[PDB]
Amino acid sequence: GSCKGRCFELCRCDNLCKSYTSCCHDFDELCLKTARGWECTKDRCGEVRNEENACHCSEDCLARGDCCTNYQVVCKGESHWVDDDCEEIKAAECPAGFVRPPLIIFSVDGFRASYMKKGSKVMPNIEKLRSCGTHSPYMRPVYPTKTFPNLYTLATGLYPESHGIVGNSMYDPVFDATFHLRGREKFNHRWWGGQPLWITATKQGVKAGTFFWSVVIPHERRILTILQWLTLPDHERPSVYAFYSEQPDFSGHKYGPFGPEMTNPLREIDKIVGQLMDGLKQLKLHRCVNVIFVGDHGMEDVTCDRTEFLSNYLTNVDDITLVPGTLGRIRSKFSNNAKYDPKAIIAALTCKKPDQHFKPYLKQHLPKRLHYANNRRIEDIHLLVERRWHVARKPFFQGDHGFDNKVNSMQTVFVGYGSTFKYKTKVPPFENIELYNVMCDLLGLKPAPNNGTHGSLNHLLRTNTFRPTMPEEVTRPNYPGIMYLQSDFDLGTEERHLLYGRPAVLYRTRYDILYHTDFESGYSEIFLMPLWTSYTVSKQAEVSSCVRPDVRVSPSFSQNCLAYKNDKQMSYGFLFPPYLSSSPEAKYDAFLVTNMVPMYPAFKRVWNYFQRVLVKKYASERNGVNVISGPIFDYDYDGLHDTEDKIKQYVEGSSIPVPTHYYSIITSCLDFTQPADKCDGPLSVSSFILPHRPDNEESCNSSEDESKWVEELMKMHTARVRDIEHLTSLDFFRKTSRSYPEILTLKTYLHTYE
């Protein structure tokens, strides 16, 4: 067939026909025209139309939507958009027949956040978008910080474990097939989970342009094609579009990120951005369209010499498959190999050499903030690789990425410009999982269920169609008085300690609220321990095997010491720490059986140091802190609070469940001139989810004093409040002086320590 009059229509002539290798004979001839380049010149103005040209400077071009983007500048005495002053867009100004502002997502592979520092000298168009619209210092990608997991997260609002694109390469045991960047496999829909934006738009009557472009199509052509689609009549014209460039990723890989030879790739991108905004301007759409400039991840210095080889750790390297590079994923090469021992492989990869540039984890043991476990495509054995290094199986580029998503070099960019974004507004860094909701809002769509926190980015937008509401409590507490007698047992405040309201329990159970001089708790009669414990340590506070029963609680719903005596490997700790009692009288409350939780001795080293040393330090640095601590049960590693039937471990012979993790949420006043308990304004929060492990193999220095390794462990396991909420089915910060959207922003904050 032929593509005459069908080039880039919505034999094939569409922008993906190369990829599926299926275009017409003259697709290349007709559609990928390059003649005379991409720029109009004085001598071309009002030319007779010449069909061989790449773009046009004829009088009829605007109507066809196929002018070169500088046509009006060169041929009609108009200004480049970038040369125009910033002017506020208080409402969308759209041509006749437009019914919503269109969205254009301008995506740049490997665009590291720091690249913005290069500034309006190198990137004048981008810098104006940034300065004039809404921006953040950076945007955090998802882990693995690779292209495919991050593009589909942007599209879906989901963690890779949920959307299914767990890596650029993956093996699915159910399919028994592997997915790769190169190959036809990736086109099969079976790999792609969730509901991406283009489908959300279609299902709700909003027409979507294409989001993907064959590598063959030049960037200038991608822009021209989008601009031509925007000239289509109402019933044919999409409301949402995406541009993509493999730059500056491609050049990052060749030259590394910090090079002076990154200046030219960055100006070539800014040129394409300028083509887009000039193009929009001449179609009178530059104050109609919302534009998102966004990257998928950053870029780090990585060279051939900085490679760890598994062959130098494992004697049986030929019996394993490794997904290599800036992360590692290991599985048995052969199906029925009884010589395959993952316990042995992990031990063989643990703290073997002094400078070792990777750490092995079973996936359930990865920091919970990475949300990287609940998929059959994620191998049990993972290697978190040190920034600047690769790992390969056995023994041309200066850059790579893929590392832990809190690493500074992996951060990427966000800018929103247009009628629905705010004007000259800076917002705090946020995570790319949150954008799908925003893009939905920008298009009047109801988002499909996702991992963004809808409302947390309302501060990016001039107007908000979506108003978040706090979830309703699913179980009300009890407030027991003395209902029992010491002889009963066979064992063997608010103003001070609860500063943001009681956490709401969002599932069916039975729990009691408990008051004490030093702390308040919500005790669960199902799990035989608190779901949370809340206490406040003032800046100027002091640090200095009794277990006694709790009168307010039936022996039926209390733990016993005998169970710990009998469990050889399990000890116990306390959620409110005796070391922080206000008085020796108060201190006996800290030894109640209702304050007690099961802890491995190895973990007690971590927990005791946190409670006895770090909490004081934090209270000293931040002008007091409020701490809320508790247990987490996540045996199926889905990131969600477990029901009883999922719990796979109990204190021996008992019905006391063993937690997979212990959390803390540590809050103070952002205005540190105010104490934590007398804070008028915005809050400051840091949180962790510590794995409750029977050894400290994760910490290669753990034979040293706790001051040399505990805090590093805790920083690695930093978390968002939101992460803890999912894991506990609790809702926090319900009674503050702040708006609920502001609190949603606060619950999504991650303290990174970078």
Ligand SMILES: *[C@@H]1O[C@H](CO)[C@@H](O[C@@H]2O[C@H](CO)[C@@H](O[C@@H]3O[C@H](CO)[C@@H](O)[C@H](O)[C@@H]3O)[C@H](O)[C@H]2NC(C)=O)[C@H](O)[C@H]1NC(C)=O
């Ligand atoms: C990230 O967001 C996703 C999507 O909201 C969450 O995954 C969803 O999790 C729920 C709870 O397990 C699943 O609900 C189940 O849905 C099926 C119907 O498909 C129903 O038969 C079950 O009774 C239950 O209601 C849901 O399928 C699942 N959706 C997706 C796309 O995975 C996920 O939990 C979030 N992750 C975190 C850590 O918050």
Ligand SMILES: N#C/C(=C\c1cn(Cc2ccc(F)cc2)c2cc(Cl)ccc12)c1ccc(C(=O)O)cc1
């Ligand atoms: N086109 C393209 C390609 C990728 C991307 C297309 N978009 C646009 C986008 C925007 C918003 C959104 F929700 C989802 C997607 C991207 C956006 C980001 Cl942030 C990252 C990567 C990409 C691409 C296509 C083919 C090939 C190949 O090897 O054949 C390689 C890459």
Ligand SMILES: [Ca+2]
């Ligand atoms: Ca769970």
Ligand code: NA
């Ligand atoms: Na014991």
Ligand code: NA
């Ligand atoms: Na150790």
Ligand SMILES: [Zn+2]
């Ligand atoms: Zn990428």
